[PDB]
A = this chain, B = another copy of it.
Amino acid sequence: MKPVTLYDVAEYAGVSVATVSRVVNQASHVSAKTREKVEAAMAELNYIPNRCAQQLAGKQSL
């Protein structure tokens, strides 16, 4: 089973998963317009990230 994800809102927003992950990661390098671009996307679909995927993927910097 695959619920809503960054791929979905990224698709919605147009962008990639790299853009959404930024917003999901507190944008920063994502432009204000884009931050809203994906948040709006997240909102419609009801985007909920997974703490594990974030933990695992976030371990790249470790």
Contacts and interface: CB of A to CB of B under 8 A. Distances in A.
Contacts of A56: 50, 52-53, 56
Question: Taking chain A's interface residues, is the majority helix, strand, or loop, or is none over half, making it mixed?
Answer: helix
A55 interface: yes
A21 to B, nearest CB: 15
Copies of this chain in the oligomer: 2
7 contacts: A1-B62, A50-B56, A52-B52, A52-B55, A52-B56, A53-B56, A56-B56
Contacts of A55: 52
Interface in A43-62: 50, 52-53, 55-56, 62
Nearest to A55: B52
